[PDB]
Amino acid sequence: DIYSRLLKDRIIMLGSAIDDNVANSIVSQLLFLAAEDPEKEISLYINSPGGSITAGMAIYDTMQFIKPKVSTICIGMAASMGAFLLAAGEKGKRYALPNSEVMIHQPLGGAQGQATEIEIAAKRILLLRDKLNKVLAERTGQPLEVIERDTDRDNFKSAEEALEYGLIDKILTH
Amino acid sequence: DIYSRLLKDRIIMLGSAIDDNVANSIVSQLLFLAAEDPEKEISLYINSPGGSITAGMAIYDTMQFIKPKVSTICIGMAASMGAFLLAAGEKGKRYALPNSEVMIHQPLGGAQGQATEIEIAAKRILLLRDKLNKVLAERTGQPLEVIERDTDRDNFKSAEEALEYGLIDKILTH
């Protein structure tokens, strides 16, 4: 496989929507590479529309847990949890290609049943939102309330705007 | 496979609609070949109706990043983003077979929901249109105003017209 060939160079490819399967696989690669060489940096290539919050957090927590610094590169599009993971790359090592797109918004979900059940679901998603936004705040330099305001609606940003926002550190120009 | 054999010769096959799966595959191959030899040119054969704008830009951005000059060959049909990638080939290294076809037009998309949501989708697709048209004018040498008027509706061109327009450099024959 071509991807297995990239893995040998410590490059992990996140190029699809994020679900438990993708998360479990990426978590595995991160642990693997961390074992191969806990010193060597790891590069996470991201081109995904995002996906599951819990799956995304599983990847996030693993990136933080391992010793190797994880660089993130936005290719094509890093949306929602994909953008969250892009912004979670080692500080100073978060990149984007010149015409890449980065989009941030709020968590999506649903609730059906009794007022009580709907309340439980509502409380959870709002809690998940705050949890994500606090991290984004820390990662970008924007205060929580600004992250909140700016993610109320789908917020698409160019590479330049993402840099200005604090989501990435550098654009791979030329 | 028969393509693995072509890869050995530094030939990348873009013979299907462009989606994230394809784009990521092409990106890997591009990085692989540039790694194998950052000097020798790379050939990107294109027979595609196009596809996702972001997936397309990911391929485009990679072609621009790598040291190896990337030639492009339109076989059969290069439409929409496929036509964009064709025109993005190393200047002077853009080819098309005699009965090949090239088509350019504007981005396609959708928007459903509240007025505010529709507006967000509209602003984005319009920005993409400008971004793509700007590059097309640079690659073809055609003034922006012409690119805008000429991509208003589906614009099909023969290998001859594509050459006259500045989308390709030479038409293969014998």
Binding site: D9, R10, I11, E41, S43, Y45, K93, Y95, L97 | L31
Partner: peptide, 6 residues
Amino acid sequence: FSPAAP
């Protein structure tokens, strides 16, 4: 995609 990731 090096310089610098690898």
